[PDB]
Design a protein around this ligand. Structure first.
Ligand SMILES: [Mg+2]
Length: 202
């Protein structure tokens, strides 16, 4: 029943351009990490860029830890999709509204952003233009329902799709399985159609 806020987080992909002044240890940390697909995945690992993924995995993991603390919702539902855009790697973070009133969201997000800078970037802010941004109505903070996910996130394919994470049960297999995403999209649109059909009838 509750909606979701959306935070878009840009992820650096060019060290000198995106992250001027970053530490050597940060560079080594990125280099060291390797990721593998789960056995049930049908994705092509070749199309997935490991270094940006390392940064993204931590950013989402840390954002969520902070969110749980400010929200006081330990079990908050989330869906995060990491994507390769035309200009930037970026992350769509959808998190439920519970525990955070809209009036105070800017202050909380701001606190979270500082924590990410400390933890991920080791005190050096990324040189990305509007890097941590809540989706707004023009206006106030946008809230969207669960339908946003089948409509705008699930349809993505490689290489635009890089990775995804969730705690929402209906999407757990969808995250890294293209065949499953495809099925879910079709299923959602089917429901929508059936609903309109009913409406015309009656
Ligand atoms: Mg996008």
């Amino acid at each position: 029943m509750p909606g979701f806020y959306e935070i878009v987080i840009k992820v650096p992909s060019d060290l000198d351009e995106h992250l001027p002044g970053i530490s050597d240890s940060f560079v080594n940390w990125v280099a060291e990490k390797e990721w593998e697909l789960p056995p049930d995945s049908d994705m092509d690992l070749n199309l997935i860029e490991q270094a940006p993924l390392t940064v993204a995995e931590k950013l989402q993991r840390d954002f969520l830890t902070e969110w749980r603390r400010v929200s006081k919702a330990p079990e908050a539902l989330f869906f995060v999709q990491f994507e390769k855009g035309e200009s930037y790697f970026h992350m769509h973070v959808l998190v439920e509204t519970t525990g955070v009133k809209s009036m105070v969201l800017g202050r909380f997000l701001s606190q979270i952003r500082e924590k990410l800078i400390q933890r991920i970037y080791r005190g050096i802010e990324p040189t990305l233009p509007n890097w941590f941004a809540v989706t707004k109505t023009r206006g106030g903070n946008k809230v969207v329902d669960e339908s946003y996910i089948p409509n705008y996130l699930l349809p993505k394919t490689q290489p635009e799709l890089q990775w995804a994470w969730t705690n929402m049960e209906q999407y757990l297999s969808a995250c890294l399985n293209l065949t499953e995403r495809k099925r879910l999209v079709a299923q959602h649109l089917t429901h929508v159609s059936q609903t309109q059909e009913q409406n015309k009838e009656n």
